[PDB]
Amino acid sequence: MRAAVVYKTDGHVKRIEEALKRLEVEVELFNQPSEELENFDFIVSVGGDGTILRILQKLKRCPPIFGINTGRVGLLTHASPENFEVELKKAVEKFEVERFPRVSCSAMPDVLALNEIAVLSRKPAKMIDVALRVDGVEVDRIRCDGFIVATQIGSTGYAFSAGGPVVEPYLECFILIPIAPFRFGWKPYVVSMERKIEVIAEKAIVVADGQKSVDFDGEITIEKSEFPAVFFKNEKRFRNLFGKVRSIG
Amino acid sequence: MRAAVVYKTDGHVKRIEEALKRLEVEVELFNQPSEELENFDFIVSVGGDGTILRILQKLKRCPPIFGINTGRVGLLTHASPENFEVELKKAVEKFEVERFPRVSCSAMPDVLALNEIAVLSRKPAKMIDVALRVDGVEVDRIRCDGFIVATQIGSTGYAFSAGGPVVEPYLECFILIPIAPFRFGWKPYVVSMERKIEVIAEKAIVVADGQKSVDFDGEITIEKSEFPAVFFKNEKRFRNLFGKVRSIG
Amino acid sequence: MRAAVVYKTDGHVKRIEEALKRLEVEVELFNQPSEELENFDFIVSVGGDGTILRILQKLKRCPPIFGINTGRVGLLTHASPENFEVELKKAVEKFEVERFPRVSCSAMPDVLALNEIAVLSRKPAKMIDVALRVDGVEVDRIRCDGFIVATQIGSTGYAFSAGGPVVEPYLECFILIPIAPFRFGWKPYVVSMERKIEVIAEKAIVVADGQKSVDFDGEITIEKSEFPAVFFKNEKRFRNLFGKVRSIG
Amino acid sequence: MRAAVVYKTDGHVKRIEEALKRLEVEVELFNQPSEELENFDFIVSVGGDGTILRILQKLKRCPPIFGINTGRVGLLTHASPENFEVELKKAVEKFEVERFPRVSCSAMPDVLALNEIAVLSRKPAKMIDVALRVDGVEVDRIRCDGFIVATQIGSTGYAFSAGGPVVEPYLECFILIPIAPFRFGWKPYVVSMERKIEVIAEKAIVVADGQKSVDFDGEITIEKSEFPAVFFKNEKRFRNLFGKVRSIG
Ligand SMILES: Nc1ncnc2c1ncn2[C@@H]1O[C@H](COP(=O)(O)OP(=O)(O)OP(=O)(O)O)[C@@H](O)[C@H]1O
Ligand SMILES: Nc1ncnc2c1ncn2[C@@H]1O[C@H](COP(=O)(O)OP(=O)(O)OP(=O)(O)O)[C@@H](O)[C@H]1O
Ligand SMILES: Nc1ncnc2c1ncn2[C@@H]1O[C@H](COP(=O)(O)OP(=O)(O)OP(=O)(O)O)[C@@H](O)[C@H]1O
Ligand SMILES: Nc1ncnc2c1ncn2[C@@H]1O[C@H](COP(=O)(O)OP(=O)(O)OP(=O)(O)O)[C@@H](O)[C@H]1O
Ligand SMILES: [Mg+2]
Ligand SMILES: [Mg+2]
Ligand SMILES: [Mg+2]
Ligand SMILES: [Mg+2]
């Protein structure tokens, strides 16, 4: 097999390359994410969750990702630098994987998002008027700094900061939530990911996973794509969720 | 067919009975629900959502319920008194139903809940220490006035008041949320309804759907039951959710 | 001088008694608070914040209180058991004090509260309809589990749990906030403590500082009293607030 | 006297000018705010609250402002276009005024704010790391979209949208609150307006009342200024607050 090792910082990389060599895996090193990562049997990401999001932005078909967490919280990672070798051995030898859905947005045709699509004001400290439609029916209209359409994996990201619920990773859904809504009452809405979401706003920008962005005016449609994020199986993902969330800062 | 008409107040009853008589349905009137309601082909509830919850408290096997809303919000009802005949005719003639899961609780055998099981302090204005386990793993411990385990149908009830998300009726899940938690940070958790929930607390009471209560100490288990709530299909349930929620008060 | 030492647990008391004798202060020991505490030059509380609230419940005229924290967070305390001697000596030799307003409630004439007056449903898991008036004008009506009228000192107590803001101890105000409000929109209100607050509710109970309660129906009036809680000056009160708050749980 | 009439829209201006003429007031019309407005006895603003904020940005010494609300909620206005002549007459004849403090920030000397100073990320969807100091002590560090330092008048503006409390206009304080904080726990802080606020952030912009803005890096200080906003007395300001807030959208 051949693996790609993607690292934001140079630390721990020689060690990981050595461990992979013991597993009879050929290694190629990447200091930046690349679409060439599609040509590998699996990917080892060294960094936090953002490294993983930036890797995913290069992949349509996704080789399974193994994350070694040097960042902050590491909801998408599998191991720490202090003990990754055993978990990596398990992952390569069993080769069991999990798939989580990614969403596409009509404003950025070739871009996929694991966490969220956010619609924001082009100008900080100015609001936009956002209308939300789900399966063709207008369900809300609200003045806000922006509006988030997150997956369940994104429930612990931007949506969390905006006041959203923590949703377990195996419950497929969208979380629909405004950022700084100028209204007396508002609630996050949690809907089936099989539904079509439309967000309508003028003078806005759309951002996927905090990485890629574009101006738009009028309507954008957001729907589940055919190209999920693929990770090695983390048997502790549900258990670890609650502790990791409490450490978010 | 034979239908039971169950009413909180006697207003509108005679006209609903005459409407059923015109549909060639035999009618029996009930001023309070009873277990006898299982013997009918369908049930027409005249009242708000609480009337429906009280009807369900008496039903294991559930004949389809049609709700005529004389209450405040009416998330579980199908029509208003001003225009119910057309919708009632459609309901009886098509006889299409929807089933929503109910949960059971180990402290109260033979009691089912559509909205929530809530564990509260026995002493008002006094907190209880609550531990929460999901599929056998302790995921949180928190001091609070009480703790709610809600279905998605219950997301617009007690869980809503406690600060929970609005969840669409066709996404099956539990919402796990504290009432007045004494902690710097906390979040609602949304998990699969296939999971087993355990709530552990001393000096508490457990309440199903705001209707039935028992004192308990120690552990209670909450799980999906085999006996759902059955309603005639409301083709506008999803569309109506958003406007109805905004009117909550 | 003579000091009362009030303790919830038996443990650290002999140590505190010896420290006071070295400061030439006669000591009397109390396992429970009583009205006799008014007859002392000052009071040393050994416990958490609840022990201080229970002391205050017995005091109209309030000798200065010095708190030694054996409870959880201790916003009302001055020192810990591990190092209290130097702070106690400074407190007594300087005898500088701080006064924090307490409020009274028309339902319980001789009862005073430092944190809050709370109006709650007499029936567990059932809402009450609460109307709120400030300086004679009805400002809100809401269905809720209860309603809190807190001082700024109470902003880190029940009001905090209900979702209220943290208000610094030297900004005199009321925080008005519902517990589990069944409404799409609601906000905590912060008003001058010179204003008269009226809460109107049927089938309710009123509770002062989580300690003393009575059933009531109709209108209660809540206002600032002439008998503040008196503490030795804590020079680090403002500074310590933020760290202590982050530790609540 | 001489009055300036400032108008966002040109609709009711002729009506207002003729009314001032009846009160023997010399009128000068302004299509937009100018520092020349300082040279009038009073100012009549035709528009919503934003028009008033833009007028104030051009004023150090503030002639009393009378607001005619063509906007949406109009917390700073005194009358609607349908009935302004009676309230305007009372204002000119009694000439009773109210002063509300404005704040300055060190990044923009000579710029004053009535609602808030907000520190925001320069890039949408990108967080900044913000440290907050009050009277010289660091009281929080948080990753967020931005951070708001509001006056009590600003409690119904950006701070409101960010989840802050509603504070009555006659209780002077700062409300310190993050916008979309990436942390498990957070609270708004309400502190005395006598305190000095320092916000520290890199790659940020500071914005006064949603109008004037500048890039900054490092530290900014925010303090109460000597130049309040001056309005004609609105006898119903406290009473109207609660209804106006509930209509915010
Ligand atoms: N308040 C917030 N504003 C923007 N993004 C947020 C916020 N809170 C959580 N996030 C999450 O951050 C994710 C992007 O993570 P990322 O690691 O790229 O950003 P970062 O850690 O702040 O800094 P950098 O992009 O430079 O690594 C988004 O997908 C979003 O879900
Ligand atoms: N804050 C709250 N406290 C208790 N229950 C709540 C609250 N908010 C919403 N509810 C919902 O109310 C439901 C009970 O409905 P019910 O109609 O019996 O209550 P009610 O309308 O307040 O009382 P009643 O109908 O007997 O006059 C519960 O299942 C719960 O989901
Ligand atoms: N969720 C909550 N419910 C009730 N009280 C709360 C809550 N959160 C904070 N408090 C505060 O707790 C105060 C009472 O403190 P007290 O020490 O008596 O309670 P306790 O610590 O829970 O019980 P105890 O000390 O008897 O073991 C109240 O004045 C209130 O301000
Ligand atoms: N979510 C929000 N984002 C930014 N400002 C907000 C927000 N919610 C309320 N505000 C308030 O809006 C004020 C600015 O008012 P302003 O009238 O200029 O904005 P506007 O109503 O969006 O109109 P416009 O941007 O065209 O001038 C700020 O001082 C702030 O207090
Ligand atoms: Mg990052
Ligand atoms: Mg009811
Ligand atoms: Mg206690
Ligand atoms: Mg405006």
Helical (H) or strand (E) element with A110: strand A108-113
Radius of gyration of chain A (CA): 19
Nearest CA in chain D to A118: D125
Backbone angles phi, psi at D221, to 5 degrees: -105, 140
Q: Give dist(CA A83, CA D198) in Å, integer.
A: 42
Nearest atom within ligand 1 for CA of residue A211 = 18
**In a 3-state reduction of DSSP, which class is residue B56?**
helix
Q: Give dist(CA D204, CA D122) in Å, integer.
A: 5
Q: Is A2 known as a binding-site position?
A: no
One DSSP character per residue, B135-175 reads TTEEEEEEEESEEEEEESGGGGTHHHHTTPPEE-TTS--EE
Find out whether A156 and C154 touch, Cβ atoms under 8 Å: no
Find out whether A47 and A33 touch, Cβ atoms under 8 Å: no
- Residue A10 per-residue DSSP state: S
The owner of tokens 């009030």 is C6
Q: Which amino acid is at C106?
A: S
Which residue among A70, A209, A211, A248 has the greatest number of ligand 1 atoms within 8 angstroms of its CB, and so is best to mutate?
A: A209
Q: Which amino acid is at C66?
A: F
For strand B97-100 and strand B229-232, is the pairing parallel, antiparallel, or unpaired?
antiparallel
**What are the structure tokens assigned to A178, written together?**
């405004």
Find out whether B49 and B77 touch, Cβ atoms under 8 Å: yes
**Residue A220 bridge partners (DSSP):** A199
Q: Is A142 known as a binding-site position?
A: no
Residues in chain D: 249
- What residues contact A5, with CB distance under 8 A and at least 6 apart? A13, A16, A17, A20, A27, A28, A29, A30, A43, A44, A46
Question: Are residues D147 and D201 part of one domain?
Answer: yes
Q: Give dist(CA B69, CA B216) in Å, integer.
A: 35
Q: Give dist(CA D193, CA D173) in Å, integer.
A: 4
Catalytic residues of A: 49
CATH code of the domain in which C14 resides:
3.40.50.10330
Query: Chain C: which residues have CB within 8 Å of chain A?
Result: 183-187
- What residues contact B40, with CB distance under 8 A and at least 6 apart? B2, B3, B4, B28, B63
Ligand number nearest to the C-alpha of B128: 3
Q: Which amino acid is at B62?
A: C
Residue C240 distance to chain D (closest CA, Å): 9
Measured in Å, how far apart are chain B's first and last C-alpha atoms?
Answer: 37
Q: Which of C49, C129, C135, C217 is catalytic?
A: C49
Q: Which amino acid is at A175?
A: I
Q: Give dist(CA D225, CA D105) in Å, integer.
A: 9
Residue A227 distance to chain D (closest CA, Å): 24
**What are the structure tokens assigned to C105, written together?**
């409630």
> CB–CB of D182 and A142 under 8 A?
no
- Residue B119 per-residue DSSP state: E
Ligand number nearest to the C-alpha of B127: 3
Q: Is C45 known as a binding-site position?
A: no
Question: Are residues C162 and C50 part of one domain?
Answer: no
Question: Are residues C234 and C215 part of one domain?
Answer: no
Helices D85-94 and D13-22 sit at what angle, rounded to 10 degrees? Answer: 40
Residue C117 distance to chain B (closest CA, Å): 10
**What are the structure tokens assigned to D243, written together?**
């209804």
Question: Are residues C58 and C171 part of one domain?
Answer: no
Find out whether B46 and B27 touch, Cβ atoms under 8 Å: no
Q: Which amino acid is at D25?
A: V
The owner of tokens 């022990």 is C51
Question: Are residues D129 and D16 part of one domain?
Answer: no
Facing A192 at nearest CB: one of B134, B170, B189: B170
- What residues contact B113, with CB distance under 8 A and at least 6 apart? B102, B103, B104, B105, B151, B154, B208, B209
Q: Give dist(CA D103, CA D115) in Å, integer.
A: 9
- What residues contact B194, with CB distance under 8 A and at least 6 apart? B224
- What residues contact D160, with CB distance under 8 A and at least 6 apart? A182, C187, D166, D245, D248
**In a 3-state reduction of DSSP, which class is residue A191?**
strand
Facing C245 at nearest CB: one of D165, D166, D187: D187
**Residue C28 bridge partners (DSSP):** C4
**Residue B201 bridge partners (DSSP):** B218
| Cα atoms in the 13 Å half-sphere on the side-chain side of A247 | 10
Ligand number nearest to the C-alpha of A210: 1
Q: Give dist(CA C237, CA C47) in Å, integer.
A: 18
Find out whether C143 and C181 touch, Cβ atoms under 8 Å: yes
Question: Are residues A115 and A46 part of one domain?
Answer: no
Q: Give dist(CA B150, CA B160) in Å, integer.
A: 10
Nearest CA in chain A to D208: A125
**In a 3-state reduction of DSSP, which class is residue B84?**
coil
Resolution, given in Å to one decimal, reads 1.7
Q: Give dist(CA D234, CA C160) in Å, integer.
A: 32
Number of domains in chain B: 2
Q: Is A180 known as a binding-site position?
A: yes
Burial of C35 (0-12, 13-18, 19+ CB in 10 A): exposed
Measured in Å, how far apart are chain D's first and last C-alpha atoms?
Answer: 38
**In a 3-state reduction of DSSP, which class is residue B105?**
strand
Contacts of B145 in chain C (CB under 8 A): 145, 161, 179-180
CA proximity to C1, closest of C20, C26, C18 = C26
> CB–CB of A161 and D181 under 8 A?
yes
Measured in Å, how far apart are chain A's first and last C-alpha atoms?
Answer: 38
Nearest CA in chain C to D247: C185
Nearest CA in chain B to A164: B165
Between chain C and chain D, how many beta carbons pairs sit less than 8 Å apart?
A: 68
SS (H, E, C) chain D: CEEEEEECCCCCHHHHHHHHHHCCCEEEEECCCCHHHHHCCEEEEEECHHHHHHHHHCCCCCCCEEEEECCCCCCCCCEECCECHHHHHHHHHHCCEEEECCEEECCEEEEEECCEEEEEECCCCCCEEEEEEECCEEEEEEEECEEEEEECHHHHCHHHHCCCCEECCCCCCEEEEEECCCCCECCCEEECCCCCEEEEEEEEEEEECCCEEEEEEEEEEEEECCCCEEEECCCCHHHHHHHHHHCCC
Question: Are residues B59 and B19 part of one domain?
Answer: yes
Measured in whole angstroms, the distance separating CA B25 from the mean position of its chain's CA atoms is 27
Question: Are residues D110 and D72 part of one domain?
Answer: no
Burial of B51 (0-12, 13-18, 19+ CB in 10 A): buried
Q: Give dist(CA D1, CA D10) in Å, integer.
A: 23
One DSSP character per residue, chain C reads -EEEEEESSSTTHHHHHHHHHHTT-EEEEESS--GGGGGSSEEEEEE-HHHHHHHHTT-SS---EEEEE-SSS-TT--BBTTB-HHHHHHHHHH--EEEE--EEETTEEEEEESSEEEEEESSTT--EEEEEEETTEEEEEEEESEEEEEESGGGGTHHHHTTPPEE-TTS--EEEEEES--SSB---EEE-TTS-EEEEEEEEEEEETTTEEEEEEEEEEEEE-S--EEEE--TTHHHHHHHHHHT--
Degrees (nearest 5) of the Cα angle C47, C52, C56?
155
For strand C212-224 and strand C229-232, is the pairing parallel, antiparallel, or unpaired?
unpaired
- Residue A79 per-residue DSSP state: B
Residues in chain B: 249
Question: Are residues C200 and C165 part of one domain?
Answer: yes
Helices B85-94 and B13-22 sit at what angle, rounded to 10 degrees? Answer: 40
CA proximity to A120, closest of D246, D126, B58, C4 = D126
> CB–CB of C124 and B179 under 8 A?
no
Q: Give dist(CA C69, CA C78) in Å, integer.
A: 7
For chain B, strand residue ranges (E) read 2-7, 26-30, 42-47, 65-69, 97-100, 103-105, 108-113, 116-121, 128-134, 137-144, 146-151, 166-167, 174-179, 189-191, 197-208, 212-224, 229-232
Find out whether D245 and C187 touch, Cβ atoms under 8 Å: yes
The owner of tokens 């009480």 is B146
Nearest CA in chain D to A129: D249
Question: Are residues B19 and B109 part of one domain?
Answer: no
Range of the domain at C150: 102-226
Find out whether B192 and B224 touch, Cβ atoms under 8 Å: no
Q: Give dist(CA C209, CA C116) in Å, integer.
A: 5
Burial of D227 (0-12, 13-18, 19+ CB in 10 A): middle
Q: Give dist(CA D158, CA C10) in Å, integer.
A: 51
CATH code of the domain in which A184 resides:
2.60.200.30
Facing D190 at nearest CB: one of C167, C245, C246: C167
Nearest atom within ligand 2 for CA of residue B48 = 17
Contacts of D180 in chain A (CB under 8 A): 145, 158, 161-162, 179-180
- Residue A86 per-residue DSSP state: H
Q: Give dist(CA D3, CA B205) in Å, integer.
A: 67
Q: Give dist(CA B185, CA B180) in Å, integer.
A: 12
The owner of tokens 């109805």 is B244
Question: Are residues C134 and C44 part of one domain?
Answer: no
User: Which of the residues A167, A183, A244 would you substitute to probe the B interface, choosing the one with the greatest number of B C-beta atoms within 10 Å?
Assistant: A167
Burial of C236 (0-12, 13-18, 19+ CB in 10 A): exposed
Q: After which residues is chain B broken (C to N over 2.5 A)?
A: none
Find out whether A154 and A164 touch, Cβ atoms under 8 Å: no
Q: How far is the CA of D182 from the centre of ligand 1 (A)?
A: 9
Helices C13-22 and C85-94 sit at what angle, rounded to 10 degrees? Answer: 40
- Residue A164 per-residue DSSP state: P
Q: Which of B49, B110, B135, B217 is catalytic?
A: B49
The owner of tokens 């929620």 is B245
Neighbouring CB atoms inside 10 A of D82's CB total: 7
Q: How far is the CA of C231 from the centre of ligand 7 (A)?
A: 19
The owner of tokens 């890797």 is A55
- What residues contact A51, with CB distance under 8 A and at least 6 apart? A6, A7, A8, A33, A45, A67, A71
Ligand number nearest to the C-alpha of D54: 4
Question: Are residues A142 and A73 part of one domain?
Answer: no
Q: Give dist(CA A86, CA C119) in Å, integer.
A: 57
Find out whether B125 and C210 touch, Cβ atoms under 8 Å: yes
**What are the structure tokens assigned to A63, written together?**
């080789």
Q: Give dist(CA B227, CA B58) in Å, integer.
A: 12
Residues in chain A: 249
Helical (H) or strand (E) element with A242: helix A237-246
Q: Give dist(CA D170, CA C193) in Å, integer.
A: 11
Helices A13-22 and A85-94 sit at what angle, rounded to 10 degrees? Answer: 40
**What are the structure tokens assigned to A194, written together?**
């099989």
Find out whether A159 and A148 touch, Cβ atoms under 8 Å: yes
Q: Is D104 known as a binding-site position?
A: no
* B140 is annotated as an active-site residue: no
Nearest atom within ligand 1 for CA of residue D179 = 1
**Residue D5 bridge partners (DSSP):** D29, D44
Degrees (nearest 5) of the Cα angle A177, D167, B186?
40
Burial of D57 (0-12, 13-18, 19+ CB in 10 A): middle
Degrees (nearest 5) of the Cα angle B47, B52, B54?
110
Find out whether C198 and C133 touch, Cβ atoms under 8 Å: yes
Q: Give dist(CA B178, CA B175) in Å, integer.
A: 10
Find out whether A28 and A5 touch, Cβ atoms under 8 Å: yes
Residue A74 distance to chain D (closest CA, Å): 14
CA-CA-CA-CA dihedral for D222, D227, D232, D238, to nearest 10: 30
Backbone angles phi, psi at A220, to 5 degrees: -130, 145
Q: Is C211 known as a binding-site position?
A: yes
CA proximity to D246, closest of B83, C181, A25 = C181
Q: Extract long-range pairs of C38-42: CB within 8 Å, 24+ residues apart.
A: C38/C62, C38/C63, C39/C2, C40/C2, C40/C3, C40/C4, C41/C1, C41/C2, C41/C3, C42/C1, C42/C3, C42/C4, C42/C66, C42/C92, C42/C232
SS (H, E, C) C36-67: HHHHCCEEEEEECHHHHHHHHCCCCCCCCEEE
Q: How far is the CA of A249 from the centre of ligand 1 (A)?
A: 12
Q: Give dist(CA B25, CA A214) in Å, integer.
A: 61
Q: Give dist(CA D105, CA D212) in Å, integer.
A: 11
**In a 3-state reduction of DSSP, which class is residue A122?**
coil
